Curated annotation (Swiss-Prot), chain B:
Gene coding for it: S
Role played: Subunit of the fusion protein that is processed upon entry into the host cell. Mediates fusion of the virion and cellular membranes by functioning as a class I viral fusion protein. Contains a viral fusion peptide that is unmasked after S2 cleavage. This cleavage can occur at the cell membrane by host TMPRSS2 or during endocytosis by host CSTL. In either case, this triggers an extensive and irreversible conformational change that leads to fusion of the viral envelope with the cellular cytoplasmic membrane, releasing viral genomic RNA into the host cell cytoplasm.
Protein name according to UniProt: Spike protein S2'
Coiled coil stretches, renumbered: 3-47
Biological source species: Severe acute respiratory syndrome coronavirus 2
Swiss-Prot record, chain D:
Region of the whole protein represented: 408 to 454 of 1273
Protein's job: Attaches the virion to the cell membrane by interacting with host receptor, initiating the infection. The major receptor is host ACE2. When S2/S2' has been cleaved, binding to the receptor triggers direct fusion at the cell membrane. When S2/S2' has not been cleaved, binding to the receptor results in internalization of the virus by endocytosis using host TFRC and GRM2 and leading to fusion of the virion membrane with the host endosomal membrane. Alternatively, may use NRP1/NRP2 and integrin as entry receptors.
Effect on the protein of changing R1S: In strain: Omicron/BA.2, Omicron/BA.2.12.1, Omicron/BA.2.75, Omicron/BA.4, Omicron/BA.5, Omicron/BQ.1.1, Omicron/XBB.1.5, Omicron/EG.5.1
Organism: Severe acute respiratory syndrome coronavirus 2
Reported effect, L43R: In strain: Delta/B.1.617.2, Epsilon/B.1.427/B.1.429, Kappa/B.1.617.1, Lambda/C.37, 19B/501Y, Omicron/BA.4, Omicron/BA.5, Omicron/BQ.1.1; Contributes to cellular immunity evasion and increases infectivity
UniProt subunit comment: Binds to host ACE2. RBD also interacts with the N-linked glycan on 'Asn-90' of ACE2. Cleavage of S generates a polybasic C-terminal sequence on S1 that binds to host Neuropilin-1 (NRP1) and Neuropilin-2 (NRP2) receptors. Interacts with host integrin alpha-5/beta-1 (ITGA5:ITGB1) and with ACE2 in complex with integrin alpha-5/beta-1 (ITGA5:ITGB1). May interact via cytoplasmic c-terminus with M protein. May interact (via N-terminus) with host bilirubin and biliverdin, thereby preventing antibody binding to the SARS-CoV-2 spike NTD via an allosteric mechanism.
Name of this protein: Spike protein S1
Outcome (variant: Y44F): Decreased HLA binding to NF9 epitope. Increased binding affinity to human ACE2
Region described as Immunodominant HLA epitope recognized by the CD8+: 39-45
């Protein structure tokens, strides 16, 4: 006999409100992966990709890539997850030297001319260039993270089609910027309508969660995107199509206690 | 003696709530940001921290 | 020629709204009550180091100060920012300009953007190639010093320039003093109001009263 | 290399998926002496 606390009441979410900026431009990965002449490792190019829609599934399904190593994203969810800036690092190196391109590796490609941060977020995409870059191709030479280094420490390669471990590999390193900001690069996922005052399963710009989107008086500043709580959970978001401010109250919950006399 | 009873419990709850904003070795203190950015073989390492 | 730096150098450290919370942060800030350098535009633009970020102010009445030149060598040998504001548009270039020995204004390019009474408080720093401009304008009535008071600084423009900067120089519109602070890794404790605006900040290395304000996470120390 | 508990790929996702809690052994060797011909009988989906 007595009051016994058993379970937790939780209102289940009704639907899913997926929301993304309504931009339709496609991101120019073809100008990166199918460019004619790649720059060398000591002068690797840093192409900003911004304000477009990045179909990473095309880059994941093509069999023309030797290794496709993502260190922090696990690339299945690249379509849903969406970023602010994506930086493509294009350079061509010796065949065995792709292994040194990892967060944590040390070496004369790692320390000297192209250093990765150990907290890196992105994907290392490598494939060979035996059909085009192999000639005595001598134009490819080598010498802080992301530091373009413009007896000599300048040593040049020799690439020939007779050379596996010495074949010129085209490697492109995508760097991802997960700063909480107005997002620009977002993958091909369609946005739905917005429903207020209902327990929904929202997704704003790659921020998942469950809550009751209401109207607010929280006047954000025109650079501010997220409003946070004390406990780092997001309390208010800004709708990335119609720039209004929405509270996120989590759905109605409470303890369930079962008052009973004894089963005797 | 009675305001201290109220203060020492609002202190120990507002220390407990601020522990949710700590990384504990994981990459992000938001649990819905690990699930939306990592694969289930790797994400179970971060969530176990 | 120095002056006092009363409460200035307080910017929004991120793009996240927070209201009615005493949030602590560790970033490159201007230390309170330090030495900001007083300069001239009367009857003066040497080459200033950058070491860890640079505060800027400009007591203005007729828009004399109109340009910035950054870099390390600044003679079209390395990339050089040239923020140009000719009264209607904000032209921002990173080209290797053939500058003069005294560049001014008379009354391989990798990026280009085209958009006393006034104190144009500016903050310039590099974070791993992400050059961040923090700024704030305010109506003041003071000719001599920084006005004692408080006002926060918002961002305008991020720049992914990747430029090594150790030195710089500003520009003038020759026919207005301007200050050079230096940013340091000073932990603050920002007081966001109900509207999410910083009304108060406490430098956690100023005096041992202020470390007590930071440890308690409060401003009224009992 | 894609045949591992935890790997993703067009052999992993499409036609032969391993459980991530797998108990067993992956035993691989080459067949250059017998299966190499234009041997076209081996297909994938």
């Amino acid at each position: 006999k007595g009051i016994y606390q058993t379970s937790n009441f939780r209102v289940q979410p009704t639907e899913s409100i997926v929301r993304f900026p309504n931009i339709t431009n496609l991101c120019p990965f073809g100008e990166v992966f199918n460019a004619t002449r790649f720059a060398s490792v000591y002068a690797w190019n840093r192409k900003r990709i911004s304000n477009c829609v990045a179909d990473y599934s095309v880059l994941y399904n093509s069999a023309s890539f030797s290794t496709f190593k993502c260190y922090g994203v696990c690339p299945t969810k690249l379509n849903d997850l969406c970023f602010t800036n994506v930086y493509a690092d294009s350079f061509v190196i010796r065949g065995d030297e792709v292994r040194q391109i990892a967060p944590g590796q040390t070496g004369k490609i790692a320390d000297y001319n192209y250093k990765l941060p150990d907290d890196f977020t992105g994907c290392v995409i490598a494939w060979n260039s035996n059909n085009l870059d192999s000639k005595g191709n001598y134009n490819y030479l080598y010498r802080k993270p992301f530091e373009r280094d413009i007896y000599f420490p300048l040593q040049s390669y020799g690439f020939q089609p007779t050379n596996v471990g010495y074949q010129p590999y085209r490697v492109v390193v995508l760097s991802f910027e997960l700063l909480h900001a107005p997002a620009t690069v977002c993958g091909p996922k369609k946005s739905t309508n917005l429903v207020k005052n209902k327990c929904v399963n929202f997704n704003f710009n790659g921020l998942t969660g469950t809550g009751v989107l209401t109207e607010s008086n929280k006047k954000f500043l025109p650079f501010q995107q997220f409003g946070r709580d004390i406990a780092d959970t997001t309390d208010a978001v800004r709708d990335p199509q119609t720039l209004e401010i929405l509270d996120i109250t989590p759905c109605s919950f409470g303890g369930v206690s079962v008052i009973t006399p004894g089963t005797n | 003696k009675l305001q201290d009873v109220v203060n020492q419990n609002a202190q120990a709850l507002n220390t407990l709530v601020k522990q949710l904003s700590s990384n504990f070795g994981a990459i992000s203190s938001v649990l819905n940001d690990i699930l939306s950015r990592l694969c289930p073989p790797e994400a179970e390492v971060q969530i176990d921290r | 020629a120095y002056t006092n730096s009363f409460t200035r150098g307080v910017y929004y450290p991120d793009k996240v709204f927070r209201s009615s919370v005493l949030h602590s942060t560790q970033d490159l800030f201007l230390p309170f009550f330090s030495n900001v350098t007083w300069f001239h535009a009367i009857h003066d633009n040497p080459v200033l180091p950058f070491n860890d970020g640079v505060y800027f102010a400009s007591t203005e009445k007729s828009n004399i100060i109109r340009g910035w030149i950054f870099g390390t060598t600044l003679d079209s040998k390395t990339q050089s920012l040239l923020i140009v504001n000719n009264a209607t548009n904000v032209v921002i270039k990173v080209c290797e300009f053939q500058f003069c020995n005294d560049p001014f204004l008379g009354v391989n390019c990798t990026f280009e953007y085209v958009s006393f009474k006034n104190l144009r408080e500016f903050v310039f720093k590099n974070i791993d190639g992400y050059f961040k401009i923090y700024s704030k304008h305010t109506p003041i009535n003071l000719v001599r010093d920084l006005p004692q008071g408080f006002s926060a600084l918002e961002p305008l423009v991020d720049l992914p320039i990747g430029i090594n900067i150790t030195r710089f120089q500003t520009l003038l519109a020759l026919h207005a003093a301007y200050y050079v602070g230096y940013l340091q890794p000073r932990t603050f404790l920002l007081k966001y109001n109900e509207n999410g605006t910083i009304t108060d900040a406490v430098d956690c290395a100023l005096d041992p009263l202020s470390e007590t304000k930071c440890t308690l996470k409060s401003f009224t120390v009992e």
